[PDB]
Structure formats: structure tokens, C-alpha cells
Ligand binder design. Structure first.
Ligand code: CLA
Ligand code: CLA
Ligand code: CLA
Ligand code: CLA
Ligand code: CLA
Ligand code: CLA
Ligand SMILES: CCCCCCCCCCCCCCCC(=O)OC[C@H](COP(=O)(O)OC[C@@H](O)CO)OC(=O)CCCCCCCCCCCCCCC
Ligand SMILES: CCCCCCCCCCCCCCCC(=O)OC[C@H](COP(=O)(O)OC[C@@H](O)CO)OC(=O)CCCCCCCCCCCCCCC
Ligand SMILES: CC(=O)O[C@H]1CC(C)(C)C(=C=C/C(C)=C/C=C/C(C)=C/C=C/C=C(C)/C=C/C=C(\C)C(=O)C[C@@]23O[C@]2(C)C[C@@H](O)CC3(C)C)[C@](C)(O)C1
Ligand SMILES: CC(=O)O[C@H]1CC(C)(C)C(=C=C/C(C)=C/C=C/C(C)=C/C=C/C=C(C)/C=C/C=C(\C)C(=O)C[C@@]23O[C@]2(C)C[C@@H](O)CC3(C)C)[C@](C)(O)C1
Ligand SMILES: CC1=C(C#C/C(C)=C/C=C/C(C)=C/C=C/C=C(C)/C=C/C=C(C)/C=C/[C@@]23O[C@]2(C)C[C@@H](O)CC3(C)C)C(C)(C)C[C@H](O)C1
Lengths: 173, 161, 168, 179
């Protein structure tokens, strides 16, 4: 049921014109739920990770042995991805590769009604937090991700097609 | 006898100038439909062949491995002069296998003669009334009648020039 | 009392309920050996022959890419080597152990009351499933006869080339 | 007694000649299975061809365009030599890999009957009468399995088949209709 779900706010309510929540079973909807939950958290970190990396925040010192943080007083934030060395790019994926495991190896997987993906390290005891005010936050968490999923696509389209975005094309990136 | 059957149609109708079904001298009530349909089916693929096989649309590549292309092969009885004689047998043979193995009543559920498949010229056809059968089985039969006079022309006019 | 096939020697016993039965056993092998093993042999010799009769003819004209066209089928192993040949026969083995649930000798085969000769369980398309007995007997007479023709065939195809030195 | 045919019009024809006189009900299943396999294959092929023609390849859509990684096989060069003359430029290693996945899938469709592989059998589960129904059971996040879905899938299959056949023909030689 789309009623009783965080993510249904005031200006639209149940937003499903093409009826995709009905398209599978209840296990199907739980997969799309934590997809959008995960699509949000990647896009929120990438949108915010685009705005800085563009104003010059600049970690002091050396990233690696000879490829130190000149990647910011230089090439666009969409770049500095091949400038990061391979052993540096490798440990990023593998910390993620580890983090995708505890996410999957809980006692009850979430499409069987289990909990949503939680923090891998330092997991405070969690949302023992007043479930009325818990529902307001999961609306806040998803809506900021909804806005960030659009925004990171704006940032790619501006870096590929100049003039594809009006009040944003006059920005050095 | 067979004045109300398939093929009798205006302006002529039943028109037997030889007295062919006028008796059963060699059981003319059957097989003469089958002998009339069978020649025409050859002729309809022949004339829709031969006119398209005059217009100049060819298969790509070569007829064999030795480089003889299809575009070098002209139309007519001259096309058999540029078929090597090993091809002339196999062109007959697996067609001759069809005469003994698909060109006969195989399953025994034939409503008619030329009735072999039952389901694949069913071209949205099941909806149409039994009368539509008699129409497009006259239209089968009379295309085949008129394509022989097409192909007997287009074989004799080549030799006449 | 007398044989149907050759009517001047006595009729062979213990060949009655079999498909191509015309009483042809003048040397009396069915008197001495188990009849289920002999039938299973004759079907298998026939099926390998029928595949080899297609093979011997189609190999001259079709060749799969990567190999070398050989004019005579008989010279093909030399043109394929030994490694490729051993792979064929060792996998034939693995296909034969799974075939009869591990009962591969003349003492272990036909030790179950099931397991009739030639019934592999092989029928992916559904040919002869749910039909009557006379039709089943008729189609089994065709597999034997075509297999017997192919055994004496695959001799001639192979033998013709032995003398001569050119394809079929 | 088969599944739904043409929606606008229907016609079974060549079906009772093999599922009654020549074969039986077991042949019916097999035929349907084969049809579904072909349909799916055609669909994928169609999509691939479409993508290739359009231009959305690795160079256009991602940061990596070097497929060979030793044989100097970039995506740009393979996207500039059409679709039919590109499959022949694929490195043997890659070909081997692809054949592997397909082989595995086919074997599964052959051994693993229902939930798990069958250890003892005269022949493979799918090599028996009605060995392969058509459905492999692969239904990740399965939305629905109704009587409409199946029909739709089938229709998309035949259509895809025809489409790709036509496409291939046209790349090779004068077809008939436009593209
Ligand atoms: C290629 C794909 C593939 C798949 C998906 C599987 C999957 C499986 N194998 Mg097989 N296997 C494979 C290839 C595959 N195998 C190959 C190439 C070999 C070597 C030749 C084996 C050798 C083998 C052995 C020896 C054994 C298995 C076992 C199993 C099953 C685990 C045992 C069990 O109790 O689960 C049962 C599953 C369920 C109860 C859930 C059923 C739900 C269905 C839908 C299955 C899940 C979907 C399906 C697997 C996905 C395939 C679709 C594909 C497009 C990805 C599991 C279903 C074990 C087994 O099944 O027997 C005890 C086992 O002993 N496998
Ligand atoms: C606590 C364990 C630990 C330890 C001992 C190290 C140790 C190291 N990291 Mg590091 N790293 C860690 C955790 C750790 N990391 C974590 C958790 C992350 C986030 C996923 C990273 C992300 C990271 C990046 C992005 C890079 C390193 C790099 C390096 C190496 C610098 C060598 C150099 O300059 O080239 C001699 C050094 C061996 C750099 C490297 O190896 O490339 C030069 C580099 O680029 N690290
Ligand atoms: C160099 C040898 C050679 C030559 C000269 C030919 C020549 C020919 N082939 Mg051919 N063919 C060859 C090798 C060759 N093929 C090989 C190696 C194969 C693989 C088995 C075939 C398989 C083949 C088939 C299946 C058919 C032909 C057919 C034909 C003939 C068309 C005749 C026609 O329309 O009547 C005017 C043509 C003459 C057709 C035929 O004769 O039947 C036909 O349908 N070819
Ligand atoms: C020359 C091409 C050709 C060929 C090979 C056939 C062949 C056949 N026709 Mg067809 N037919 C043709 C032209 C042809 N016909 C024409 C021009 C018409 C319009 C008169 C028809 C109308 C027609 C009908 C209406 C039917 C056939 C049927 C049949 C089958 C008997 C047989 C396969 C029958 C079928 O599907 O059942 C066997 C059937 O009912 N034919
Ligand atoms: C290899 C793919 C394949 C297979 C196995 C089948 C199999 C089947 N189809 Mg089918 N179909 C296909 C492709 C395929 N089709 C394509 C591309 C289309 C779109 C034109 C259709 C459209 C279609 C309709 C509209 C219907 C079926 C139906 C059926 C079923 C009954 C008909 C029958 O007995 O077989 C058909 C005959 C064969 C499979 C024989 C094989 C063909 C020979 C060997 C070679 C033909 C080559 C040919 C020249 C290729 C060019 C295309 C052609 C149009 C000229 C049967 C399971 C019917 C059904 O579900 O039951 C009522 C049905 O309603 N099909
Ligand atoms: C996670 C598993 C995995 C890994 C590590 C690789 C790794 C590799 N693949 Mg790959 N591949 C995989 C799964 C994987 N593949 C699957 C599932 C498929 C589909 C069947 C392919 C299809 C594939 C193709 C088609 C090709 C590669 C190639 C390559 C290699 C570049 C060789 C230089 C690279 C090492 C390329 C290669 O070998 O080039 C020489 C290549 O052309 N692979
Ligand atoms: C809690 C359990 C911990 C599990 C460990 C795994 C995650 C560890 C992350 C950090 C590694 C830190 C070790 C420090 C080591 C250190 O920092 O060395 C730095 C080293 C840099 O090497 P370079 O070749 O760049 O250096 C050459 C120059 O340094 C010489 O001039 O980077 C690494 O080797 C990357 C390690 C990635 C390893 C991937 C791990 C395994 C996952 C594989 C799964 C993927 C394939 C399967 C997919 C299905
Ligand atoms: C690369 C190929 C290797 C893949 C192995 C394929 C496994 C075959 C399938 C097993 C049957 C399973 C069916 C039911 C399972 C079953 O119960 O049957 C097991 C089967 C015998 O089964 P039974 O006991 O029912 O047979 C009757 C016995 O009771 C005897 O009276 O023995 C084997 O599995 C042999 C497997 C081949 C072993 C290959 C090893 C090679 C050794 C050869 C040494 C060479 C010496 C050279 C000279 C010096
Ligand atoms: C076209 C043109 O020219 O104009 C431009 C205009 C403009 C405005 C530039 C454009 C834009 C898009 C915008 C403005 C996009 C913004 C997107 C947005 C809103 C991105 C938020 C990310 C949230 C983060 C990072 C939060 C992490 C929060 C983290 C990591 C937490 O710790 C969670 C937290 O809860 C805990 C667990 C503990 C709590 O105690 C509280 C905190 C927070 C600590 C366009 C569309 O591109 C076009
Ligand atoms: C009355 C009448 O008319 O007939 C009746 C009787 C009759 C005819 C028997 C009937 C039937 C059955 C029919 C018509 C069956 C036909 C089935 C048909 C026509 C099946 C095609 C499959 C195509 C495939 C699998 C292609 C895969 C393509 C693949 C796998 C690709 O790789 C594509 C590829 O491009 C990529 C993506 C990338 C490239 O780098 C490489 C290539 C180029 C290879 C009917 C329906 O009952 C009608
Ligand atoms: C809701 C709904 C519908 C819908 C929908 C919609 C709108 C779906 C939209 C989905 C959308 C819009 C999903 C975005 C993903 C973007 C991601 C994951 C960003 C990755 C960013 C990554 C991985 C990081 C990139 C960087 O590392 C790089 C490369 C450089 C570094 O310096 C750092 C940064 C971060 C810059 C329908 C279709 C209308 C039907 C019905 O209504 C149901």
C-alpha cells in the first residue's frame, strides 16, 4: 500500500501515475523503496561533492606519493577521477564492496519485511527515536535525495552540453 | 453434374468444349481439379517469378565457390545454359522429394485437393464466411488458369523473338 | 518349429517378444547370451551407424570454420589430430555412465526389473508419447531396419575409399 | 489447445498436423518453448542493433572505450564499421567468454529441474517428453505472471524476430520497406 509510507508528502501525495507500485508483489515495492533510498544517498553525496570540489576546499598535503591535491586548482570536478591513482580508486570500491554486505546479510532481508540499510560503522542505537518524528525525517531524507537525483543529472548535462541549462551555464565548473 | 462447382463463373460458366466430365471414361469427376490446380501453381510462381526475374533484381554473391556470380546469369532458357549440370539435377531432386513427401494428402483431413497444410494461409481467414472460401478458391484457381497463359506466352515469345 | 527367415534350420528359441523377429539366428547366439543385452547392442550399433552415415556424406560439403576440408571422410582424424579425437571418445564415456545410472557391464546392466532395451528416456520433442501399442511397435520396427541398413551401409561408405583414394 | 494467437486475427493451421497426427501434446510444449527462446533472442538482438545504429556505445555513454585491452580494440573503431562487420572484430578471448555464459544458461535449462539439479537420471530432465516448458523460473522482483503478460511477451517476440531479420537483410542487400 502506497498509503502509510514515508515519501508521500503534501504537494503530491501518492505520486504514481503509471502504477508501478502495483506492478509486482509487496516484495517488489520493498525493492524499489530501498533503491530510491540508496539512489538518494549516492546523489546527495555527489551533488554536495560537486559544489565543493568546485570552490576550492583543498585537503592539505598529499593524496598519494606524487599525485597530491593539485586536482582542485585544475580540472573540473567531473574530472579528477582518472587523476586519483588506481590503488586509491581501489580501496574506495572495496570499502563500498564491504558495506554492501552487511546491508545484505542482516537477519531479515528487507524485501522480506526487514530493516532498511543501516550504517556499517559506529551504528549508534538507532531510530529508537519517537516514531512520529521518525516519519517526518524519512520524508526529509528522501525529498532531499529526490532533489539531488535531478541536480546531479543537471551537473552532468551542463558539463557535456553547453547551454543546456540557462541560469547555470554561466558558471565556471 | 459439375455446373455448380468451383471454376464455373460468368461470363462462361460451365464450359466444357471437349466433353471431359461428360462421362467417367477415366474418372473425370475427380483429379481434374487436381491436375488443373497443380499446373497453375507452378505457373503463378513462374510468372510472378519471371516478370520479377526479368526486371533485374538479383541475389548477391556467387552461385558457387568458383566466383560465378548471379548477376552474370541472364533471364530465360538462357539461364539454364549457365547452370552447370550438377545443379540441374539437384534443382529437380529436392523438388522431386516434395512431390512424393509433401505434395500429397499426408494427414487425411483434406477438405479438398491442394489441401495439404490447414492453417498457414489462414490470413485472418477463420472469421470469413464459408462463402469467402469459394471466392478465394476461385481466385486461387483462376489466377492459376490465367498464369499459364502468362507463362506459356513468356516461354514461347522468347523462342519467337 | 522351423525358422521363418531361413526355412531349413530349426526355429530359434527365446526370441519371441521382440520387434524385428523373423527367427534369424542360425549360429544360435540367443541360446547362449542374454537377449536384452543383444537387443541393446543391435540398437546402439545401429544408432552409431545412422549418425555415421550422415556424417560421412555431409562432411564432404559443409565443413565448420576453423578446420581443414578433407576430400575423403576417412582421412579426417589425421586432419583433426588426436587431442580432438580423444575428447570425443572420453566424453562419449561420460555420456554412457550417466546413461545407465552406472551399470555399464554385461552383468550390471539389466539388473533392475525396469530398464528395457533401447529406452533411454530420450524424447525432447514428444515423438511417440501417449499413443497406442501397434503404432509404437511400428515405429520401433523402423529404427531397427534403418539401423541395420546403416550398419551394412557404413561398411560400404568406409570400404569404398579403402581401395580407391578419392571421396564418395 | 495452444496459447493465444494473433490478436487482430487468429490462425493455428500447422499445429494439429504434428500435435495429433505426427506428434502429440508433448510436441506442443516443445514447439512453444522453441518459439519463446527464439523470440527472446530476437528481442535482445534487436536492441543491440538499435543501440549500435544510434550511437550509444562506450565512447558516447561511459569513460571506457578500449574493449581489447591488449588487441587495441576501441569502441570507436567498432562503432564506425557497422553492426555486421563489428561482430567479426571481437577478440577470441571475448568470444570464448560469451560462449561460456550461454553454455551455462543452456545447461541449467537442462539439468536443474525445478529448484535443484538432478543427480541420477537416464537422460537430462529437459531431454524427456516436455523437458523444457519455456519458463526457466527466472523471475527476479517478479511483477506479475498473468495470462496477459505471457501473450504480450510472445507478441513482442515474433515482432522482434521479424524486425531484426529485416534489419539484417537491409544491411546486406536491398530490402523492401523503409527503416
Ligand atoms: C548457471 C546458473 C545456475 C543456477 C542459477 C544454479 C542454481 C542452483 N544450483 Mg547449480 N550448477 C550450475 C549452474 C547453476 N546452478 C552449473 C553450471 C553446475 C555444474 C555443472 C551446477 C552444479 C550444481 C550442484 C552439484 C548442485 C547445484 C545446486 C544449485 C541450487 C542450490 C541448492 C538448492 O537447494 O536450491 C534450490 C532452490 C530453491 C529451492 C529455490 C527455487 C527458486 C528457483 C526460481 C531457483 C532460483 C532462480 C534460478 C536458480 C535462477 C536461474 C535463472 C538464470 C537466468 C540466472 C541452486 C538452485 C545444488 C542443488 O540444487 O541440489 C541440492 C547442488 O547440489 N548446482
Ligand atoms: C586504516 C587503514 C589504512 C591504511 C594503512 C592506508 C594506507 C594508505 N593509503 Mg588509504 N584509505 C583508507 C585506509 C587506509 N589507507 C580508507 C578507509 C580509505 C577510504 C576508502 C582510503 C583511501 C585512500 C586513497 C583514496 C588513497 C589511499 C592511499 C594510501 C597509501 C599512500 C601510499 C602512497 O602515497 O603511495 C606510495 C597508504 C599505503 C593512496 C594510494 O595508495 O595511492 C597513492 C590513495 O590514493 N588511501
Ligand atoms: C563448386 C561447386 C558447386 C557448384 C557449381 C554449385 C552450383 C549450384 N548449386 Mg550448389 N552447393 C555447393 C557447391 C556447388 N554448387 C556446396 C558445396 C553445397 C553444400 C552442400 C551446395 C548446396 C546447394 C543447395 C542446397 C542447392 C544448390 C543449388 C545449386 C544450383 C542452382 C541451379 C538452379 O537454380 O537451376 C537452374 C547451382 C548450379 C540448388 C540446387 O541445385 O538444388 C540448391 O538448392 N547448392
Ligand atoms: C503460387 C503460389 C501458391 C502456392 C504455392 C499455393 C499453395 C497452396 N494453397 Mg494457395 N492460393 C494462391 C497461390 C498459391 N497457393 C492464390 C493466388 C490464391 C488466391 C486464389 C490462393 C488461395 C488459397 C486458399 C483460399 C487456400 C489455399 C491453400 C493452399 C494449400 C493447398 C497449398 C499450400 C489452402 C490452405 O491453407 O489449406 C490447405 C486454402 O484454403 N490457397
Ligand atoms: C523459430 C521461431 C518460431 C517458432 C518455433 C514458432 C512456432 C510456433 N508459432 Mg510462430 N512466429 C514466428 C516464429 C516462430 N514460431 C514469427 C517470426 C512470427 C511472426 C511472423 C510468428 C507468428 C506466429 C503467429 C501469428 C502464431 C504463431 C504460432 C506458433 C505455434 C503454432 C504454429 C506451428 O506449428 O509452427 C509454425 C511453423 C514452424 C515453426 C515451422 C518452421 C519454419 C520453417 C522450418 C522455415 C521457415 C523459414 C522462413 C522462410 C523464414 C521467413 C519468415 C516467414 C514469415 C516467411 C508454434 C509453437 C501460433 C500459435 O501460438 O498458436 C495458434 C500463432 O497464433 N506464430
Ligand atoms: C566479474 C567477472 C568478470 C571479469 C573480472 C571480467 C574481466 C575481463 N573481461 Mg569479461 N565478461 C564477463 C565477466 C567478467 N569479465 C561476463 C559475465 C561476460 C559476458 C559473457 C563478459 C564478456 C566479455 C567480453 C565480450 C570481453 C571480455 C573481456 C575481458 C577482459 C579484458 C582483457 C584484456 C577483462 C580481464 C574482453 C577480452 O577478453 O578482451 C581480450 C572482451 O572482449 N569479457
Ligand atoms: C574488515 C575487513 C577488511 C576487508 C578488507 C577489504 C577492504 C579493504 C579496504 C582497504 C585496503 C587497505 C589495505 C592497505 C593497502 C595500501 O593502502 O596499499 C596502497 C596500494 C597502492 O598500490 P599502487 O600499486 O597504487 O602503488 C604502487 C606505488 O605505491 C609504488 O610507487 O593500494 C592497494 O593496493 C589497494 C587495495 C585494494 C584491495 C581490494 C580488496 C579485496 C576486495 C576484492 C573484491 C573485488 C573483486 C570481487 C568482486 C566480486
Ligand atoms: C573427465 C570425465 C570424468 C567425469 C566423471 C563422470 C562420472 C560418471 C558418472 C558416475 C555414475 C553416476 C550414476 C549413479 C552413481 C552410481 O552409483 O554408480 C557408480 C558407478 C558404479 O555403479 P554401480 O555400483 O551401480 O555399478 C555396479 C556395481 O555394483 C558393480 O557390480 O561407478 C562410478 O561411478 C565410476 C565413475 C567413473 C570414474 C572415473 C575415474 C577414472 C578411473 C579410470 C582409471 C584408469 C586406469 C588406466 C589403466 C592404468
Ligand atoms: C539551471 C541553472 O542554471 O540553475 C541551477 C540552480 C541550482 C540551484 C544550482 C540547481 C540546483 C540544485 C540544487 C540546489 C540541489 C541541491 C540538492 C541537495 C538538497 C543536496 C543535499 C544533500 C544532502 C546532504 C549532503 C546531507 C547529508 C547528511 C548527512 C551525511 C548526515 O549526516 C545525515 C544526518 O541525519 C544524520 C544521520 C544526523 C542528523 O543529526 C542530521 C544529519 C544531517 C547529520 C540546478 C537544478 O542545478 C540548476
Ligand atoms: C501462413 C504462413 O505464412 O506461415 C505460417 C507457418 C509458419 C511459416 C511455419 C509459421 C511460423 C513460424 C515462424 C515464422 C518462425 C520464424 C521464426 C523466426 C523468424 C525466428 C528468427 C529469429 C532471429 C534470431 C534468433 C536472431 C537473433 C540475433 C542475434 C542473437 C544477434 O546476435 C543479433 C546481432 O545484432 C546483434 C544484436 C549485434 C551484432 O553485432 C550481431 C548480430 C547481428 C548477430 C507461422 C507463424 O505459423 C505462419
Ligand atoms: C517516480 C516515478 C518515475 C520516475 C522517475 C525518475 C525521475 C527517476 C529518476 C532517477 C534519477 C534521476 C536517478 C539519478 C541517479 C544519479 C546518481 C545515482 C548519481 C551518481 C553520481 C556518482 C556515482 C558520482 C559522480 C562523481 O564521482 C564523480 C564522477 C566525480 C567526483 O568528483 C564526485 C562525483 C559525485 C561528481 C516515473 C518514471 C515518472 C514513473 C512513476 O511516476 C514513478
Amino acid at each position: 500500500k502506497v498509503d502509510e509510507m514515508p515519501g508521500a508528502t503534501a504537494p503530491l501525495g501518492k505520486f504514481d501515475p503509471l502504477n508501478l507500485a502495483t506492478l509486482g508483489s509487496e516484495s517488489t515495492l520493498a525493492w524499489f523503496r530501498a533503491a530510491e533510498l540508496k539512489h538518494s544517498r549516492v546523489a546527495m553525496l555527489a551533488t554536495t561533492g560537486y559544489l565543493v570540489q568546485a570552490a576550492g576546499i583543498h585537503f592539505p598535503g598529499m593524496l598519494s606519493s606524487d599525485v597530491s591535491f593539485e586536482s582542485l586548482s585544475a580540472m573540473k570536478p567531473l574530472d579528477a577521477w582518472d587523476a586519483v591513482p588506481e590503488g586509491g580508486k581501489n580501496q574506495i570500491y572495496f570499502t563500498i564492496f564491504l558495506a554492501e554486505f552487511i546491508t545484505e546479510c542482516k537477519g531479515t532481508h528487507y524485501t522480506k519485511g526487514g530493516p532498511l540499510p543501516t550504517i556499517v560503522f559506529p551504528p549508534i542505537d538507532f531510530s529508537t527515536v519517537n516514531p512520529e518524528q521518525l516519519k517526518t525525517r524519512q520524508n526529509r531524507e528522501l525529498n532531499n535525495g529526490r532533489l539531488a537525483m535531478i541536480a546531479i543529472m543537471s551537473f552532468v548535462a551542463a558539463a557535456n552540453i553547453p547551454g543546456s541549462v540557462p541560469a547555470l551555464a554561466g558558471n565556471p565548473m | 453434374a459439375f455446373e455448380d462447382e468451383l471454376g464455373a463463373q460468368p461470363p462462361l460458366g460451365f464450359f466444357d468444349p471437349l466433353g471431359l466430365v461428360a462421362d467417367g471414361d477415366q474418372e473425370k469427376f475427380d483429379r481434374l481439379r487436381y491436375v488443373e490446380i497443380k499446373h497453375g501453381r507452378i505457373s503463378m510462381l513462374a510468372v510472378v517469378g519471371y516478370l520479377v526475374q526479368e526486371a533485374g533484381v538479383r541475389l548477391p554473391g556467387t552461385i558457387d565457390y568458383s566466383g560465378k556470380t548471379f548477376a552474370e546469369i541472364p533471364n530465360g532458357f538462357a539461364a539454364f545454359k549457365e547452370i552447370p549440370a550438377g545443379g540441374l539435377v539437384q534443382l529437380l531432386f529436392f523438388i522431386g522429394v516434395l512431390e512424393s513427401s509433401v505434395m500429397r494428402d499426408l494427414t487425411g483431413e483434406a477438405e479438398f485437393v491442394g489441401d495439404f497444410r490447414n492453417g498457414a494461409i489462414d490470413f485472418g481467414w477463420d472469421t470469413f464466411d464459408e462463402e469467402t472460401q469459394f471466392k478465394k478458391r476461385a481466385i486461387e484457381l483462376n489466377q492459376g488458369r490465367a498464369a499459364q497463359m502468362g507463362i506459356l506466352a513468356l516461354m514461347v515469345h522468347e523462342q519467337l523473338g | 518349429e522351423m525358422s521363418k527367415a531361413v526355412p531349413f534350420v530349426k526355429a530359434p528359441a527365446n526370441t519371441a517378444g521382440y520387434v524385428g523377429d523373423v527367427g534369424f539366428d542360425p549360429l544360435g547366439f540367443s541360446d547362449y547370451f542374454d537377449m536384452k543385452w543383444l537387443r541393446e547392442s543391435e540398437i546402439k550399433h545401429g544408432r552409431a551407424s545412422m549418425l555415421a552415415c550422415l556424417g560421412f556424406v555431409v562432411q564432404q560439403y559443409i565443413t565448420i570454420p576453423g578446420y581443414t576440408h578433407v576430400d575423403d571422410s576417412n582421412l579426417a582424424p589425421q586432419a583433426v589430430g588426436v587431442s580432438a579425437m580423444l575428447q570425443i571418445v572420453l566424453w562419449m564415456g561420460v555420456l554412457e555412465f550417466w546413461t545407465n545410472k552406472g551399470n555399464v557391464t554385461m552383468e550390471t546392466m539389466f539388473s533392475s526389473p525396469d530398464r528395457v532395451p533401447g529406452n533411454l528416456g530420450f524424447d525432447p520433442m514428444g515423438l511417440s508419447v501417449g499413443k497406442s501399442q501397434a503404432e509404437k511397435d511400428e515405429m520401433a520396427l523402423k529404427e531397427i531396419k534403418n539401423g541395420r541398413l546403416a550398419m551394412l551401409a557404413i561398411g560400404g561408405m568406409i570400404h569404398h575409399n579403402w581401395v580407391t583414394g578419392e571421396p564418395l | 489447445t495452444p496459447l493465444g494467437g494473433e490478436p487482430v486475427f487468429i490462425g493455428e493451421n500447422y499445429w494439429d498436423k504434428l500435435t495429433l497426427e505426427y506428434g502429440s501434446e508433448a510436441t506442443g510444449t516443445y514447439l512453444r518453448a522453441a518459439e519463446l527462446k527464439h523470440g527472446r533472442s530476437a528481442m535482445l538482438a534487436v536492441t543491440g542493433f538499435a543501440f549500435h545504429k544510434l550511437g550509444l556505445t562506450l565512447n558516447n555513454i561511459s569513460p571506457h572505450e578500449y574493449l581489447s585491452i591488449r588487441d587495441n580494440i576501441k569502441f570507436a573503431d567498432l562503432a564506425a564499421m557497422s553492426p555486421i562487420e563489428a561482430v567479426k572484430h571481437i577478440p577470441a578471448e571475448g568470444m570464448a567468454q560469451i560462449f561460456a555464459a550461454i553454455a551455462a544458461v543452456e545447461i541449467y535449462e537442462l539439468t536443474h529441474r525445478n529448484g535443484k539439479l538432478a543427480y541420477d537420471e537416464s537422460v537430462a530432465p529437459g531431454l524427456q517428453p516436455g523437458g523444457l516448458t519455456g519458463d526457466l523460473g527466472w523471475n527476479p522482483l517478479n511483477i506479475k505472471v498473468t495470462d496477459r503478460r505471457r501473450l504480450s511477451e510472445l507478441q513482442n517476440g515474433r515482432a522482434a524476430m521479424f524486425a531484426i531479420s529485416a534489419w539484417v537483410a537491409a544491411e546486406a542487400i536491398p530490402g523492401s520497406v523503409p527503416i
